[PDB]
Amino acid sequence: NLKITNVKTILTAPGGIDLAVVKIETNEPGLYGLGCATFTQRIFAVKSAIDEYMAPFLVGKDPTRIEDIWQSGVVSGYWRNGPIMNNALSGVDMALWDIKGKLAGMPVYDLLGGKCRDGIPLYCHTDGGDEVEVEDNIRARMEEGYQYVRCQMGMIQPKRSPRSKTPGIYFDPDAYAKSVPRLFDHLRNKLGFGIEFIHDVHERVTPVTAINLAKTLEQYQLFYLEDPVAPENIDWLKMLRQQSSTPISMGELFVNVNEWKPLIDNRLIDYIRCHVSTIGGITPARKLAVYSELNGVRTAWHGPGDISPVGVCANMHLDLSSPNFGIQEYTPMNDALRDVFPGCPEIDHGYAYLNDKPGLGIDIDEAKAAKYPCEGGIPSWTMARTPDGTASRP
Amino acid sequence: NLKITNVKTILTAPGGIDLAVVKIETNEPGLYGLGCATFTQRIFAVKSAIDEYMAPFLVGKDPTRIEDIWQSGVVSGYWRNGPIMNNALSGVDMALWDIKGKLAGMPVYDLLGGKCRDGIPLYCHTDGGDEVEVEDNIRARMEEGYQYVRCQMGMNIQPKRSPRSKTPGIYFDPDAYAKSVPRLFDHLRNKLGFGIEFIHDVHERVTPVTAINLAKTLEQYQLFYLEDPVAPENIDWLKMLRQQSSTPISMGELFVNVNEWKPLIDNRLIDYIRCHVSTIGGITPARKLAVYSELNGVRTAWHGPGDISPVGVCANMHLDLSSPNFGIQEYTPMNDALRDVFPGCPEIDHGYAYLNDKPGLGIDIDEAKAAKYPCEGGIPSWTMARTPDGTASRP
Ligand SMILES: [Cl-]
Ligand SMILES: [Cl-]
Ligand SMILES: [Cl-]
Ligand SMILES: [Cl-]
Ligand SMILES: [Cl-]
Ligand SMILES: [Cl-]
Ligand SMILES: [Cl-]
Known part of the structure; x- marks a missing residue:
């Protein structure tokens, strides 16, 4: 009777670089999973995609169905195949693997x-x-x-x-x-x-x-x-x-x-x-x-x-x-x-x-994570120009 | 510290068709895995391959390393890629997946x-x-x-x-x-x-x-x-x-x-x-x-x-x-x-x-009941297919 109860996005930058981490909670006490959704240059847009859309997609579902959740979630917005979309899915997907390993007692x-x-x-x-x-x-x-x-x-x-x-x-x-x-x-x-x-x-x-x-x-x-x-x-x-x-x-x-x-x-x-x-x-x-x-x-x-x-x-x-x-x-x-x-x-x-340790063998201290808020902004290095001034792929 | 302790080939034909099933025992009491090795037309050669060569390759190894066992086992005889060779590997591989499922408490x-x-x-x-x-x-x-x-x-x-x-x-x-x-x-x-x-x-x-x-x-x-x-x-x-x-x-x-x-x-x-x-x-x-x-x-x-x-x-x-x-x-x-x-x-x-x-493959074998249906061997008639002029054909 295992169910997803909560999906949140934790934004934190302990190494001076914006990170996004998805926590999936379940109806089994103390059983949660973590996943990475780090597309650092669009971290707030990733958060928006998870909080607004992935969260209502998942609550009430059996988390053991990793593939079904991936296949259905990938197409849930019809359009797909992008860095913001893929990161939103990853946060969830990795968390479900983390939960599966925990349930199995294996990495x-x-x-x-x-x-x-x-x-x-x-x-x-x-x-x-x-x-x-x-x-x-x-x-x-x-x-x-x-x-x-x-x-x-x-x-x-x-x-x-x-x-x-x-x-x-x-x-x-x-x-x-x-x-x-x-x-x-x-x-x-x-x-x-x-x-x-x-x-x-x-x-x-x-x-x-x-x-x-x-x-x-x-x-x-x-x-x-x-x-x-x-x-x-x-x-x-x-x-x-x-x-x-x-x-x-x-x-x-x-x-x-x-x-x-x-x-x-x-x-x-x-x-x-x-x-x-x-x-x-x-x-x-x-x-x-x-x-x-x-x-x-x-x-x-x-x-x-x-x-x-x-x-x-x-x-x-x-x-x-x-x-x-x-x-x-x-x-x-x-x-x-x-x-x-x-x-x-x-x-x-x-x-x-x-x-x-079971699952991904990793945890997050949410109180400690909150001490390092995300910076946002736009990187300078992606505005690359060749000698004549042509905007180039960085 | 889990180890393979025994690998055996069970030969049985309850459906009137020769089957090979591998049972892999471990050093954890009650924990074993089952795998299919059924190439029916060459069942005794499959048994020979498993008993003589796979059993001594596996005893003492950690069964949780499925891929490492597959990758090393597939090349253990140098030559590879054939129906008898692959069936010997499958008996083992499937049994190990069974073991992993039992250990995880999941199918x-x-x-x-x-x-x-x-x-x-x-x-x-x-x-x-x-x-x-x-x-x-x-x-x-x-x-x-x-x-x-x-x-x-x-x-x-x-x-x-x-x-x-x-x-x-x-x-x-x-x-x-x-x-x-x-x-x-x-x-x-x-x-x-x-x-x-x-x-x-x-x-x-x-x-x-x-x-x-x-x-x-x-x-x-x-x-x-x-x-x-x-x-x-x-x-x-x-x-x-x-x-x-x-x-x-x-x-x-x-x-x-x-x-x-x-x-x-x-x-x-x-x-x-x-x-x-x-x-x-x-x-x-x-x-x-x-x-x-x-x-x-x-x-x-x-x-x-x-x-x-x-x-x-x-x-x-x-x-x-x-x-x-x-x-x-x-x-x-x-x-x-x-x-x-x-x-x-x-x-x-x-x-x-x-x-x-049930965990693993959700299947078991009763060895006493299996022994009541020994394998037959012999050669199928249907594989000797001929076209009207008598040419031996692929069946
Ligand atoms: Cl996108
Ligand atoms: Cl690239
Ligand atoms: Cl360089
Ligand atoms: Cl062969
Ligand atoms: Cl028919
Ligand atoms: Cl038919
Ligand atoms: Cl026909």
Whole structure:
């Protein structure tokens, strides 16, 4: 006779980044589930979608029917397949998985097939102001035990702009593209080939530029080259895959089956990068991991700062239960996040270790969460402009 | 600290058909899991594979690691992807899912995402000696509540005369057959109308272009599906079929290899997948296939003949209840002995199956009762199929 009684959205920013967490309560005393709905740049719109529409959709329903709730909820507004819509669904979906694990007395990874590895290998970012900082940051991370690192340019000369400039964060894609191989030549000379390197193109250059970059980086044996094209340009990956053998990852921006499915169907990528909440939670991410598995494509779920610890846990339960796990991107959490969210995964020398508590093994202290209210506002970095002032995909 | 302590193969034939059921015991008293390993025609070789090789692979391992056991077990002999190999894995895989469900206090369908429908629609066979017997069988099954039926010729155009001597076999005329099917369906639609859903199984009996022409001729009769229009060895003909016909197609009870179903589902060349769950290696792979099918809009139609244990029957149905893209469940009525040996058989009520809500697969086996029906072995006569000139044909 188990029923959903309450659905609320908790907005909190313990790490200085707006988060959304869905709590589903039931008619069984002390039984609730948590899920992540973090699309940080539209957090208030996500809250609106959950509070106004998902809440009346769910109250009175049997929470054990995860798939039925997903399939019906996904179409409940007719229109669908978007980042705000998918996050609203994810909050619910992950919470239901959390409830199912609690009822079963097992971690979500055990519901999904049990452990497929002994730890979850991580990669971290090495963001620096210039090349020497980046290199030292890599060395510091390798000392901490990281065996996979993202390497970017520091935060040839850029082109001169026109005589007036429309405000934005200016970037020179051609200067960038011509400079990346030099960076990796230097890093491989200094650090060797044992360490795994990731580089994120992050949709910043024209497609043929990305393809040429992929070819020029083959000799440096990257673990992957990430987002060489925008999702609007996935139709360029066929050409890239006729020419380059640099491993490719795509997908943190994906919100639609018609973005990832042609890529995985045609083996045009080697790693899938979706932000789990932004494709709708554990239910659809699990199916995607499986679809990827049968095509020899591996998982690399998005692991930035703009994911709640509930979402971090969701990534990692998928990770532990997938034979085709590739890598887990990881952004270190501060003490406030660990305090607000007891049960954060244990980070030890480049590997993550999940506790073996039931469901997602994570909780939220609502009183503590309330101490860190959301900021809102609009990010500056998404107003990217090329030297002539053209608004570009960031 | 849960461990597998014993793996055994129970061989029993309460329905007069050889079955293999794996029982996996643990170091927790009373906790065990059951799985189907029924490839009936090779049952003793399935037992040999499990007892000699799977049992020592598993003893002492943590049974909660289903996927790790599947992934390591599938490659434990290096060579893989076959009906005997896959059935040995399925016995184990299904038993482990049973164990996981028992441990969780929940049916396997609930582990897999919960109920996606309120009952499982079935189809049954209407096997008859001639056309009127088949038509009466359809009426009888419609009276019982079946809303979907398989319709075949009686077990017309005269068959071809054979050469002056004949090599023994079960003779069949594929051209007489193919020219007669549309007439059968014209008659059945004239008498019974279009509300009843019809399935027809080609069962790999004709050349591919014959099957393509037959699919086209049967369009007007609106079949729920036309089944196995080609052999697995001829799946490269389905592209041409799908350029021309819109009759829904099912394929796959013979499949044992990812390279059989994957190009078909990748290119949407079928509408239903028909694999025998144990024969592709269990719930673990069948679930993956159901999901791969879902994203391609392909629906499930797991094989449900007599040569499947009640444990396999339940495994099909736990998959069925938890798949959004469930299509249909073929169902073969069971006898008293099967029900007696295997307590927990699903409720069959007016064309729907209703699983009990017990943990695991909700099925058990009585080993003392099972021992009363020893397996027979031997060779089926029907698989020695020959065309009129005596050519050995795919049955
Ligand atoms: Cl949206
Ligand atoms: Cl960069
Ligand atoms: Cl992307
Ligand atoms: Cl074999
Ligand atoms: Cl029949
Ligand atoms: Cl029939
Ligand atoms: Cl027939």
